[PDB]
Write an enzyme that holds these catalytic residues in place. Sequence first.
Site, PDB file in Angstrom:
ATOM      1  N   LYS A   1       0.843  -1.199   0.000  1.00  0.00           N
ATOM      2  CA  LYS A   1       0.000   0.000   0.000  1.00  0.00           C
ATOM      3  C   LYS A   1       0.891   1.266   0.000  1.00  0.00           C
ATOM      4  O   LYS A   1       0.477   2.283  -0.510  1.00  0.00           O
ATOM      5  CB  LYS A   1      -0.955  -0.045   1.187  1.00  0.00           C
TER       6      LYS A   1
ATOM      7  N   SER B   1      -4.352   0.467   7.002  1.00  0.00           N
ATOM      8  CA  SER B   1      -4.371  -0.709   6.151  1.00  0.00           C
ATOM      9  C   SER B   1      -5.698  -0.958   5.477  1.00  0.00           C
ATOM     10  O   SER B   1      -6.020  -2.094   5.170  1.00  0.00           O
ATOM     11  CB  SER B   1      -3.824  -1.972   6.879  1.00  0.00           C
TER      12      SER B   1
ATOM     13  N   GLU C   1      -7.414  -6.439  -3.203  1.00  0.00           N
ATOM     14  CA  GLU C   1      -7.848  -6.836  -1.892  1.00  0.00           C
ATOM     15  C   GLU C   1      -9.322  -7.279  -1.960  1.00  0.00           C
ATOM     16  O   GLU C   1     -10.130  -6.751  -2.726  1.00  0.00           O
ATOM     17  CB  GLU C   1      -7.671  -5.673  -0.912  1.00  0.00           C
TER      18      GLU C   1
ATOM     19  N   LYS D   1       5.055   0.574   7.610  1.00  0.00           N
ATOM     20  CA  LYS D   1       3.828  -0.081   7.122  1.00  0.00           C
ATOM     21  C   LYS D   1       3.990  -1.568   7.344  1.00  0.00           C
ATOM     22  O   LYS D   1       5.007  -2.156   6.943  1.00  0.00           O
ATOM     23  CB  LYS D   1       3.608   0.171   5.624  1.00  0.00           C
TER      24      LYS D   1
END
Length: 263
Positions: free
Chosen positions: A48, A105, A141, A209
């Site tokens: 991401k 996220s 996703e 991240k």
Amino acid sequence: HPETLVKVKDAEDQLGGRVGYIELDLASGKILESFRPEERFPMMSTFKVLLCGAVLSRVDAGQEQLGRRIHYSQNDLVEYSPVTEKHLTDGMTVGELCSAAITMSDNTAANLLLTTIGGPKELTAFLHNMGDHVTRLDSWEPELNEAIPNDERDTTTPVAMATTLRKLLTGELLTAASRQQLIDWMEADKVAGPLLRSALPAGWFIADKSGAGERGSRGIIAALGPDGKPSRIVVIYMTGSQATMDERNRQIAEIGASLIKHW
Ligand SMILES: [Ca+2]
């Protein structure tokens, strides 16, 4: 209190599967230490950051605006969308979507952003177009989240990811304002507390991240350093075991403690 490489190897002994690690000097880009640097691992949600790099590159090119408002429907929502699920009426700006994707996220945020650039193959093309001929995104996703490796879709290597992250955060591939925006989002990460942050002494800077997935998968990418200033990139990935989440977390935290204590 083990040296970092010793701890990485011990983590792997404890967990099974593989653990990969690299540490780069931020200023110079030199590799300071590594283990399995050229082996592939699933990126999980670490992608991401790269996605928002691509979005910012479009901003710098005059092709996107961080203030552009995106409306979406209930049907767009996928698993683990804690920010986007709250904005069905108002939508979210591109910049808000990158904050949600990185700091929380948020999966729908990532999908919406992927749509702005044309999908996973276009993120791969962005990476290739910056000289990373290794990292690849293939899935959306939550399929990425839900997947078992398979073992080359949606993968990077410690060195490719570390290299790429350094190129997004330093130098002139992004404008000064965009490089700063990216690191700000990472600094504001809310969901990586159990990992490197658990080991971080007072007054240090961290921008990170995390990721998690099936088959024991866990990872973190970070820019960190003392006195409020990042000075190294650290990338840690693990996959291929039956480890619990608490076990993955504890090993990453312990790798973190070793890297801090031996800094
Ligand atoms: Ca081993």
